Symmetry: C2
Subunit: 104 residues, 2 copies
């Protein structure tokens, strides 16, 4: 009863920022393993890579491992999926992960 | 450093807020909540439980409840939620876009 769950009108990509460790590069389109909750891990997909972030670079967990060296998404498929997601109002994560099993 | 990751989260991607004391809200009401750091935003209560993914000591508190009771019909509400769910649209996206229509 004390936790009100509010729904807000967030930007296009509602991605989650994670910090990359020392000497570990990843390109937009690769899958990565990251920390969620507290002591749980989950497979994610890199959407973008910038030097900035909505939150202080001091409180963003670091990626555990990059399960990819080369984007698992076609340069075309990728550009397409992102568009699709935005155009039809679908969560980027939703499209990406649902679209992966098929692409393979 | 930063890496904008897209993850496959559950159905509602709602944001948990803490209700101050002596202030109750029904699922379907609009509320004013803190965003970013020093910014306000109008949101809608999708649900209300006693639990929360995060520590109850880290959840900002609702600032104001703009509704005594649901601005959405018991029907419309039940419908919109479905719609959002069935067609894979952000619940917040559906609710706020659907609002101007239902009223005007």
């Amino acid at each position: 009863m004390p936790v009100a769950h509010v729904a807000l009108p967030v930007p296009l990509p509602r991605t989650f920022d994670y910090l990359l460790p020392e000497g570990m590069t990843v390109k937009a389109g690769c899958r990565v393993r990251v920390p969620f909750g507290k002591q749980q891990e989950r497979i994610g997909i890199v959407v973008s890579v910038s030097d900035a972030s909505e939150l202080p670079l001091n409180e963003l967990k670091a990626v555990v491992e990059v399960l990819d060296s080369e984007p698992v998404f076609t340069h075309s498929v990728w550009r397409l999926l992102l568009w699709a997601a935005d155009y039809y109002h679908h969560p980027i994560g939703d499209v990406l992960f649902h679209a992966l099993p098929i692409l393979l």
